[PDB]
């Protein structure tokens, strides 16, 4: 299990420990740079917009356009260190994608890591949200919203068919990669309890390289697709890679249960957001109800 965030109250500040290191963070930080889209959506849900001074503005998704005019510190992949320094923040918040930049960021300002543990997603989510809330004295409000998520999970789980199985795939222009439980797409299986066609795909971010022959052999009831063609802006789309007589014979094709998930949620991994996680849960529930 990933080490959680822990915090001791030191009067005007908290001494914070997480899986990357230790930081003294001021109470009520007023100049926050946020590189994780999910936690950015949690700042909105907690009414903390005016604490935010820098976001990855370049390809910000549709549900975070209230932050489109914040100073930019980057994009999905790139970080602008010069901009982050000029903003003179009191806190920087990162997740997994930016852990490679930890030491450089920490030279600028205290740097809090809100990692999502693929083996323990809900426990990491709740830890992340409540840790941010503690900084602002907003635990009450954060617990209410976490309860709302919990209730939506239980509603979705209660409609899941015990005997049907799903496959998760990530498409590129000419490539199909499968993902299973305890992946970064794993909440389908791990949180909502939809069964997997293959519970033994090996852990790791590349997933398993597959073809249509594999899809037919597995014969999934549902296929959840995360089309990376969309985030890059290429012409080939998953519907095309899947448009063949092998895929067409599957239960999922026959029952129109090839589900094209919005990659602005699933590929950008906005699970830390109190509203974006709800949107994702509802996206699955409505695909399988
Ligand atoms: Br820390
Ligand atoms: Br505007
Ligand atoms: Br993964």
């Amino acid at each position: 299990a990933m080490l959680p965030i822990s915090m001791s109250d030191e009067g005007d500040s908290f001494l914070v420990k997480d899986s990357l290191g230790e930081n003294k963070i001021p109470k009520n930080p007023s100049k926050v740079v946020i590189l994780d889209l999910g936690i950015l959506d949690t700042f909105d849900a907690l009414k903390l917009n005016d604490k935010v001074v820098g976001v990855p503005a370049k390809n910000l998704p549709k549900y975070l356009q209230q932050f489109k005019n914040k100073p930019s510190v980057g994009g999905v992949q790139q970080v602008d260190f010069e901009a982050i320094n000029a903003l003179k923040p009191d806190l920087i918040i990162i997740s997994g994608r930016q852990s490679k930049f930890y030491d450089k960021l920490k030279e600028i300002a205290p740097t809090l890591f809100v990692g999502l543990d693929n083996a323990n997603f809900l426990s990491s989510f709740e830890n992340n949200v409540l840790s941010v809330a503690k900084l602002y004295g907003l635990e009450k409000e954060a617990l209410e919203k976490i309860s709302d998520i919990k209730n939506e999970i239980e509603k979705a789980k209660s409609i899941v068919d015990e005997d049907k199985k799903a496959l998760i795939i990530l498409t590129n222009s000419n490539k199909i990669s499968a993902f299973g439980p305890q992946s970064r797409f794993g909440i389908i299986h791990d949180v909502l309890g939809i069964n997997a066609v293959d519970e033994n795909i090996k852990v790791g971010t590349l997933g398993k390289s597959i073809n249509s022959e594999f899809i037919l052999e597995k014969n999934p009831d549902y296929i959840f697709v995360v089309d990376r063609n969309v985030i890059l802006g290429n012409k080939e789309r998953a519907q095309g890679i899947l448009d063949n007589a092998l895929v067409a014979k599957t239960k999922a094709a026959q029952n129109k249960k090839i589900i094209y998930l919005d990659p602005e949620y699933w590929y950008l991994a906005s699970g830390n957001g109190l509203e974006s996680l709800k949107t994702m849960i509802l996206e699955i529930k409505n695909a399988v109800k």
Side-chain angles (χ1 to χ4, degrees), residues 7-9 11-14 16 18-23 25-57 60-61 63-75 79-81 83-96 98-103 105-106 108-125 127-133 135-139 141-161 163-174 176-201 203-205 207 209-212 214-216 218-234 237-240 242-255 257-277 279-287:
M7 311 176 35
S8 59
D9 177 322
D12 53 281
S13 62
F14 299 87
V16 185
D18 64 40
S19 64
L20 301 187
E22 285 184 51
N23 288 274
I25 304 173
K27 300 192 160 172
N28 187 21
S30 60
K31 282 208 286 178
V32 185
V33 170
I34 306 188
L35 296 175
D36 177 59
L37 300 174
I39 213 75
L40 184 57
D41 182 65
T42 282
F43 268 61
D44 180 89
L46 304 172
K47 315 305 285 169
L48 295 171
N49 307 232
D50 304 320
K51 310 303 178 178
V52 174
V53 297
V55 309
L60 207 51
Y63 56 91
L64 282 161
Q65 290 299 120
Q66 78 278 35
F67 293 109
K68 82 180 191 62
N69 302 143
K70 293 288 176 177
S72 190
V73 295
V79 178
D80 173 353
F81 288 98
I84 299 177
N85 269 294
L87 294 165
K88 297 286 169 191
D90 55 11
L91 176 57
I92 298 164
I93 312 178
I94 60 172
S95 194
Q98 307 87 37
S99 70
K100 64 199 183 279
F101 308 114
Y102 183 67
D103 295 325
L105 292 171
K106 190 173 189 170
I108 300 176
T111 298
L112 176 61
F113 179 73
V114 289
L116 287 170
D117 184 341
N118 295 339
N120 295 288
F121 176 83
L122 290 174
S123 73
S124 58
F125 162 84
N127 181 57
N128 294 338
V129 175
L130 289 172
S131 294
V132 159
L135 295 178
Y136 294 101
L138 258 28
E139 304 94 330
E141 285 77 3
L143 293 156
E144 288 175 1
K145 285 150 179 301
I146 289 166
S147 158
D148 286 342
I149 279 156
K150 280 178 172 167
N151 291 157
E152 297 293 323
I153 292 165
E154 294 310 286
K155 287 146 144 194
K157 281 183 88 156
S158 206
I159 59 60
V160 167
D161 189 315
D163 287 325
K164 287 199 173 311
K165 296 173 173 180
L167 178 58
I168 310 166
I169 65 184
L170 178 71
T171 58
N172 282 280
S173 48
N174 290 92
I176 308 173
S177 295
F179 287 83
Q182 308 215 345
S183 70
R184 70 184 183 278
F185 313 109
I187 63 181
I188 287 163
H189 299 124
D190 306 324
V191 171
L192 298 186
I194 295 163
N195 301 129
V197 298
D198 193 346
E199 306 273 342
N200 306 287
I201 297 163
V203 301
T205 70
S209 192
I210 60 153
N211 59 13
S212 287
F214 179 95
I215 305 178
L216 188 52
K218 295 298 101 161
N219 201 11
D221 310 282
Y222 310 109
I223 301 165
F224 293 106
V225 183
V226 176
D227 192 350
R228 190 170 168 257
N229 291 126
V230 172
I231 302 289
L232 304 164
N234 307 341
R237 294 297 162 106
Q239 284 83 350
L242 297 180
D243 177 19
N244 65 62
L246 294 156
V247 171
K249 287 192 293 282
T250 66
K251 293 179 192 163
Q254 291 281 313
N255 297 117
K257 293 300 181 175
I258 307 182
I259 305 309
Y260 290 93
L261 290 175
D262 181 348
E264 295 195 333
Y265 291 81
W266 293 87
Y267 183 78
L268 306 185
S270 67
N272 279 324
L274 282 166
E275 192 71 15
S276 54
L277 178 60
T279 300
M280 281 193 274
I281 294 157
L282 295 164
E283 190 176 11
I284 297 309
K285 189 171 83 168
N286 287 321

